[PDB]
Design a protein around this ligand. Structure first.
Ligand SMILES: CC(C)[C@H](NC(=O)[C@H](C)NC(=O)OCc1ccccc1)C(=O)N[C@@H](Cc1ccccc1)[C@@H](O)[C@H](O)[C@H](Cc1ccccc1)NC(=O)[C@@H](NC(=O)[C@H](C)NC(=O)OCc1ccccc1)C(C)C
Lengths: 99, 99
């Protein structure tokens, strides 16, 4: 789909059996989810944004369905207030910016 | 142009006579610039991101050339480590996400 940007580009995702809403975020290197049970091992990670850094749990090879497009990759889990779909995943779904 | 997302979608901008690089950020409501002299009055504002908030100066009706596309709108100036082009400006330049 072609998403304009008059509102937040929120999409439905499916990750770990759960339905979430998430923001297609070209300003995010990484994909970051809140309030998901993600199963298995992970590695400690820090991501920075405006106003500072959060600790996150890095999960590799996580399966994600973003707006009916399957991607597999790194998903950070941590206390972000918005589910973020970052470029690692946006590239996997063929997502581009256009103007 | 059609920008893929294999790297940060950084563009050249002109703002207040200055040439900056900025990130086309679909996850930003607002456009936030660092290290620019912006002339005139403003109002105090707070933006939130990952890890917290920053205080910004809000400038209204600021002229921006983003990748050869002129936009006029609200530009926040504050201690962001990345110049951000947010949706208020991305809409003005006709920018969409596509996959
Ligand atoms: C989500 C992250 C993975 C992403 N960061 C990255 O990808 C970074 C560069 N990479 C990275 O961390 O890699 C690992 C690393 C570790 C150590 C050293 C080096 C590298 C990010 O924060 N990206 C942001 C762009 C950016 C990049 C670098 C530096 C600064 C900003 C926005 O796109 C991203 O969408 C965040 C997401 C977010 C929003 C809100 C809360 C939590 C997270 N939005 C923002 O920070 C923007 N906020 C918003 O637009 C919010 C939604 N509106 C807002 O605050 O409005 C004012 C308001 C005030 C009060 C109440 C209501 C509204 C900001 C640019 C204006």
């Amino acid at each position: 789909p072609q998403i304009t940007l008059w509102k937040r580009p929120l999409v439905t995702i499916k990750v770990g059996g759960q339905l979430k809403e998430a923001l297609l975020d070209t300003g995010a290197d990484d994909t970051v989810l809140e309030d998901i049970a993600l199963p298995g091992k992970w590695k400690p990670k820090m991501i920075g944004g405006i106003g500072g850094f959060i600790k996150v749990k890095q999960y590799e090879n996580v399966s994600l369905e973003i707006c009916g497009h399957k991607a597999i990759g790194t998903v950070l889990v941590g206390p972000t207030p918005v589910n973020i779909i970052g470029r690692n995943m946006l590239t996997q779904i063929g997502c581009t910016l256009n103007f």
